[PDB]
Ligand binder design. Sequence first.
Ligand SMILES: NS(=O)(=O)c1cc(Cl)c(Cl)c(S(N)(=O)=O)c1
Ligand SMILES: [Zn+2]
Length: 258
Amino acid sequence: HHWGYGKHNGPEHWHKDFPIAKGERQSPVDIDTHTAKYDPSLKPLSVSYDQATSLRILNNGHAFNVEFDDSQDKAVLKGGPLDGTYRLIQFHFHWGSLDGQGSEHTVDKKKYAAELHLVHWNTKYGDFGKAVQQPDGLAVLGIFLKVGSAKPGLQKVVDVLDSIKTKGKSADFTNFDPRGLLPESLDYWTYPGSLTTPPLLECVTWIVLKEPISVSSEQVLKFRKLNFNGEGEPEELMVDNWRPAQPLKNRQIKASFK
Ligand SMILES: NS(=O)(=O)c1cc(Cl)c(Cl)c(S(N)(=O)=O)c1
Ligand SMILES: [Zn+2]
C-alpha cells in the first residue's frame, strides 16, 4: 500500500506513514499575492545552467525525473534568498487530468495546468542525501505551466515519454538543456517549505517564479499518457500527481518584485 495520489493512498493519507505531513512548514501553499511582501534584502537570483549535464529520465511510479550529473560544480542556483550555492540534481513536473488543475502551488487560489520543479541541493552538505536532513538543504525552483503556445525546449522531454510509459522504466537522456524551460522573467516569491511528496522533509527553500511558461495542449496531453502502474499491469493514467495547498502556519511569503 505504497503512497500515491489515489483515493486510498493519496495526500490525505500520507500523514499516517509520514507524520510531518501536518508539520509547521509544509508545501505547497497558496500564494496570496496581496499579502506577499516585497523584500529589498533579496539579492538577485542566479540561475547558471550553461554546463548542466543530464543523464537520463525515469518513471518512478508517480511522475518522471530527469536526472543530472551532480558530481561536479555545474548547473547551480544561487542568490535570491539563498546563502551559498545549490547544485541541480533533477527536475520533474506535477500535472492534472484537466487543464484547469495540476499545479501544487496556487496564486490567489488559481491552479495552473502543471508545475515544473528543478531540485538543487546545498553544496555545503556534500551531497543530496545529507542535504535533505538540513533545514536549508534544498532549493527548489518552481515554474508554472499554462496551456497555449508550445514550449520548444520541452519537446525533447515529451518525445521520450513513450519509452518510459510504466513505473520502473528509465532511458538515456543526455544533453538536455534546462535553460529552454525557463520563462523570460526571474521575478519570484520565496518561502521556507518542504518536499511536496513523501517523505515530506522540511528542508526546502522554495523559489516560485511569477511568470508561467506556456506549453501546448498536445505537450501536456502526452504527459497524461504516462502510466502510474508498471509494465504488464492494469493501466492507470498518470494524472493529478499534485499535492494540494497546505496551511501557511504564519510563515511569510516574500516577493522579489514590486
Ligand atoms: N519524490 S520526487 O522525486 O517527486 C521529489 C524529490 C525531491 Cl528531493 C523534491 Cl524536493 C520534490 S518536490 N516536489 O520538488 O518537493 C519531489
Ligand atoms: Zn515536485
